[PDB]
Ligand binder design. Structure first.
Ligand code: WUE
Length: 255
């Protein structure tokens, strides 16, 4: 009843996300981008988009491409959440608008380790060092995300846990401008119930796992606000680039 919903959500997650934590950890052992030199050759194989321009922009263009891919996937996933489809159109869109970036960063942790992160479906590996060497303000984009990932990854969740977490992020009753707050809260109530009990079953060796995750939720909301603004800065300060149209609509006057 509760069990089943966890199965249905986990399977939806498995069908709809190209990257998951089992597949990432397996990979994490091909091509390393660690300096401007190795970056260029990376751009002779991996990235088929910009295919000069300032290195900082090339990098984060490639990053926004993946954001958009994930927004697509999160939409597919959400449709498979029992009940989601039945929400008002405008609500489904508002939930995803305010939800996707929080969920993006949650799942990004899966491909990050203390050295760097998998990129482009796990065929690239850009070092944390390298990113930290990019000119301001670009060297300050990914650092807070690695910070979050190291704390998240310490909880040692698996995909079954993550799938329910991501569902709970999306189905959140307090996003600004919802119509049927009542119904979304009822949905949230159900999922969060399943999540807490699931964590207790799956990880009986950690009493406080569920509360730890609620704290991570708080962390991600702050992480997203900070990201929105640093994005805002870069839009004003740098025009050599341009933000993807779809991301422009998501970022718009939210936080
Ligand atoms: O939001 C995102 O998609 C990423 C963060 C992320 C990283 C890795 C995986 C998932 C998400 O942040 C971005 C940061 C910077 C730019 C960007 C690039 C070039 C020109 C720009 C001009 C103005 C504003 C922003 C510009 C795009 C996305």
């Amino acid at each position: 009843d509760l069990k089943s919903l966890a199965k249905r959500i986990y399977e939806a997650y498995l069908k709809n996300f190209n990257m998951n934590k089992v597949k990432a950890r397996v990979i994490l052992s091909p091509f390393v981008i660690h300096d401007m030199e190795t970056l260029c050759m990376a751009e002779k194989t991996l990235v088929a988009k910009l295919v000069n321009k300032e290195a900082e922009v090339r990098i984060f263009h490639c990053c926004q491409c993946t954001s958009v891919e994930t927004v697509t996937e999160l939409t597919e996933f959400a449709k498979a959440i029992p009940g989601f489809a039945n929400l008002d159109l405008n609500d489904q869109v508002t939930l995803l608008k305010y939800g996707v970036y929080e969920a993006i960063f949650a799942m990004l942790s899966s491909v990050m380790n203390k050295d760097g992160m998998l990129v482009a479906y796990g065929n690239g590996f850009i070092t944390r060092e390298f990113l930290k060497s990019l000119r301001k303000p670009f060297c300050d984009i990914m650092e807070p995300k690695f910070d979050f990932a190291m704390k998240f990854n310490a909880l040692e969740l698996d995909d079954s846990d993550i799938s329910l977490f991501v569902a709970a992020i999306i189905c959140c009753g307090d996003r600004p401008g919802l119509l049927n707050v009542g119904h979304i809260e009822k949905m949230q109530e159900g999922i969060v119930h399943v999540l807490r009990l699931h964590l207790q079953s799956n990880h009986p060796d950690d009493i406080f796992l569920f509360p730890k995750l609620l704290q991570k939720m708080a962390d991600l909301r702050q992480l997203v606000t900070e990201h929105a603004q640093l994005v805002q800065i870069i839009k004003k300060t740098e025009s050599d680039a341009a933000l993807h149209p779809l991301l422009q609509e998501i970022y718009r006057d939210m936080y």
